[PDB]
Write a protein that binds this ligand. Structure first.
Ligand SMILES: *[C@@H]1O[C@H](CO[C@@H]2O[C@@H](C)[C@@H](O)[C@@H](O)[C@@H]2O)[C@@H](O[C@@H]2O[C@H](CO)[C@@H](O)[C@H](O)[C@H]2NC(C)=O)[C@H](O)[C@H]1NC(C)=O
Ligand SMILES: *[C@@H]1O[C@H](CO[C@@H]2O[C@@H](C)[C@@H](O)[C@@H](O)[C@@H]2O)[C@@H](O[C@@H]2O[C@H](CO)[C@@H](O)[C@H](O)[C@H]2NC(C)=O)[C@H](O)[C@H]1NC(C)=O
Ligand SMILES: CC(C)(C)OC(=O)N1CCC[C@H](C[NH2+]CCOc2cccc3c2ccn3Cc2ccccc2)C1
Ligand SMILES: *[C@@H]1O[C@H](CO[C@@H]2O[C@@H](C)[C@@H](O)[C@@H](O)[C@@H]2O)[C@@H](O)[C@H](O)[C@H]1NC(C)=O
Ligand SMILES: *[C@@H]1O[C@H](CO)[C@@H](O)[C@H](O)[C@H]1NC(C)=O
Ligand SMILES: *[C@@H]1O[C@H](CO)[C@@H](O)[C@H](O)[C@H]1NC(C)=O
Ligand SMILES: *[C@@H]1O[C@H](CO)[C@@H](O)[C@H](O)[C@H]1NC(C)=O
Length: 526
């Protein structure tokens, strides 16, 4: 089966899914390979081809450093690239239902990974289940990460910043020009993403050049106002310079620095990325979105606060234990291979790791607000508190504050709190409902009865998949047939949200109220 696109013909492949068929187009190029003279620049439009492009395998993943903290462990290694790294990585995938749809809603996935890592080819991003089950079209794209995707010399078009975001945007563009040929409705496009993918989605809501490239948006465990999601022009330029020094590329002509960085091998840029921040951490967003005056015209907190964003519906949510995963990537006394009971002094040391440039008073105030124990003697008190600190600060309270503020400008918003721990989760139990482990439910992996998910999990994924698809098609994430709890609109006053679990889906109000008044109202002053 061959589809004629604006740039040439592309050949796909047939997939058997649940006694049905899905047509997959894996690895369609959507931009000139950003190579040589093109490294660090915005993505350039693709010159047509005459032949038939074979889009039958995932393309190259973009260059990136790899998580090597747990070699051989599926809990970490399932997130690492599963295709060759290359700078030639600006490709996208398309899953379409078979038989070919007539006017199908399109779902576009944007992966996370702190803007330093990630790839669309991961097993948990397989769109074939959504296409089969809900008859939507699923699109995902690779986008540049790290310095190669977000190196910033603001104003300088040789390295303007936000290239990876313009990569995402050129892909949304491609869907607008082409998806009708695949049976998709370019007027019914829902972006969805997780973590840095969700922050990306929220920034497309703010960027005028994306306003007309999509309809609705879903934000899973991420938003641009998260403290890790936007690099300051101060940090960015200090980081660009440190990368220059580290590679022998320091110059006075800012443009000649870039020319110098353009001759370095991709691996020399990767090696030196970690050290551009003196507070070196494997959790460091070394190179991320900036206020570039192109993609972002202003500081996004101002745009959010003053209503300068796309007026549409959003679906936003978080997981119960967003913070735990990060505790084994540097916090003292923590291990995935034991229950990580930590002392007060280990907790205090963990705050220093996660809040590096923060005053002593700032850290004491975190301790004060998170160590008023319901029981003094519980040995896991400090271990649980540090997880909640990292998750509330980095994910939950920014997503809640994003939703309140977005909804105050009159748009329907829906907030969820995912609290199911996957029965297959390879990480230990004290880690709970981890960051990233709703994704397989969203993509319908538990719908495949053959892979050891329980029956309760099949049903939960089935409902979630239905709610996501109804949100994308109809702006309203209900499951209307199986006497399901109705999902209320999130309002700035009521703050109602829906819990997602295998047992009882219920309606609650004002998630982490006390914790988020601390993080959102007080802590930004310290
Ligand atoms: C901004 O950058 C300077 C320079 O960073 C140093 O050089 C880089 C190539 C890289 O290898 C970093 O690890 C280096 O730290 C920072 O200044 C350094 O600060 C640390 C501690 O703050 C100090 O021990 C070093 O001696 C300093 N080096 C120099 C040359 O001043 C600076 O902290 C960075 N951040 C800010 C906010 O200014
Ligand atoms: C849980 O484990 C951590 C990590 O220690 C490593 O992993 C273990 C599973 C085991 O293989 C150890 O030999 C490894 O070193 C423990 O943290 C260490 O604790 C000891 C004594 O308290 C200390 O000397 C080390 O510096 C610690 N390492 C750190 C902080 O990175 C922790 O004590 C274990 N906790 C429990 C309750 O078992
Ligand atoms: C891949 C996925 C997004 C689904 O889940 C995860 O990332 N993990 C869950 C399990 C551990 C593995 C580490 N992830 C690999 C590299 O990802 C990053 C690199 C750098 C910064 C990052 C990230 C991710 C977030 N931030 C921002 C940040 C948030 C909070 C505290 C400090 C930083 C995967
Ligand atoms: C593109 O593919 C054409 C047909 O390939 C068919 O499907 C793939 C998956 C293989 O199983 C192959 O044996 C089949 O014939 C090729 O004939 C054609 O040469 C390919 N073109 C390029 C440029 O690779
Ligand atoms: C698809 O739906 C849009 C409205 O959402 C409509 O304008 C367009 O003509 C439709 N295209 C079809 C049915 O081919
Ligand atoms: C050097 O800097 C000048 C401005 O001072 C700029 O116009 C020129 O393009 C730069 N040269 C190169 C080779 O980039
Ligand atoms: C509704 O329940 C039926 C069983 O009666 C099940 O087969 C179906 O998948 C459910 N639909 C949704 C959207 O959960």
């Amino acid at each position: 089966i061959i589809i004629a696109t604006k740039n040439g013909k592309v050949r796909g492949m047939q997939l058997t899914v649940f006694g049905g068929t899905v047509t997959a187009f894996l690895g369609i190029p959507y931009a000139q390979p950003p190579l040589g003279r093109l490294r660090f620049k915005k993505p350039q439009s693709l010159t047509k081809w005459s032949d038939i492009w074979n889009a039958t395998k995932y393309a190259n993943s973009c260059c990136q450093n790899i998580d090597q903290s747990f070699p051989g462990f599926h809990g970490s290694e399932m997130w690492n690239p599963n295709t060759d790294l290359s700078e030639d990585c600006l490709y996208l995938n398309v899953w379409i239902p078979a038989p070919k749809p007539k006017n199908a809603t399109v779902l576009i996935w944007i992966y996370g990974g702190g803007f330093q890592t990630g790839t669309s080819s991961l097993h948990v991003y397989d769109g074939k289940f959504l296409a089969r089950v809900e008859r939507v079209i699923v699109v995902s794209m690779n986008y540049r990460v790290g310095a190669l995707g977000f190196l910033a010399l603001p104003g300088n078009p040789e390295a303007p910043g936000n290239m990876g975001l313009f990569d995402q945007q050129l892909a949304l563009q491609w869907v607008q020009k082409n998806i009708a040929a695949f049976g998709g409705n370019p007027k019914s496009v829902t972006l969805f993403g997780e973590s840095a993918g969700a922050a990306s989605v929220s920034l497309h809501l703010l960027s005028p050049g994306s306003h007309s490239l999509f309809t609705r948006a879903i934000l899973q465990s991420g938003s641009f106002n998260a403290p890790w999601a936007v690099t300051s022009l101060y940090e960015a330029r200090n980081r660009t310079l440190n990368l220059a020094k580290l590679t022998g590329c320091s110059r006075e002509n800012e443009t000649e620095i870039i020319k110098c960085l353009r001759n370095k091998d991709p691996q020399e840029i990767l090696l030196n990325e970690a050290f551009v921040v003196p507070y070196g951490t494997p959790l460091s967003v070394n190179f991320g979105p900036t206020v570039d005056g192109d993609f972002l015209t202003d500081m996004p907190d101002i745009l959010l606060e003053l209503g300068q964003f796309k007026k549409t519906q959003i679906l936003v949510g978080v997981n119960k234990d967003e913070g735990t995963a990060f505790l084994v990537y540097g916090a003292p006394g923590f291990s995935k291979d034991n229950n990580s009971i930590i002392t007060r002094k280990e907790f205090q040391e963990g705050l220093k790791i996660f809040f590096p440039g923060v005053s002593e008073f700032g850290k004491e105030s975190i301790l004060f607000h998170y160590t008023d124990w319901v029981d003094d003697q519980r040995p896991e008190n400090y271990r649980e508190a540090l997880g909640d600190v990292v998750g509330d600060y980095n994910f939950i309270c920014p997503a809640l504050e994003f939703t309140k503020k977005f909804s105050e400008w009159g748009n329907n918003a829906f907030f969820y709190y995912f609290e199911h721990r996957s029965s297959k989760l390879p990480w230990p139990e004290w880690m709970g409902v981890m960051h990233g482990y709703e994704i397989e439910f969203v993509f319908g992996l538990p719908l495949e009865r053959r892979d050891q998910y329980t029956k309760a999990e099949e049903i939960l994924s089935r409902s979630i998949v239905k709610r996501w698809a109804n949100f994308a098609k109809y702006g309203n994430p209900q499951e209307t047939q199986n006497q399901s709890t109705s999902w209320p609109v999130f309002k700035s006053t009521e703050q109602k949200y829906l819990t997602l679990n295998t047992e009882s889906t219920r309606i609650m109000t004002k998630l982490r109220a006390q914790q988020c008044r601390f993080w959102t109202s007080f802590f930004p002053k310290v």
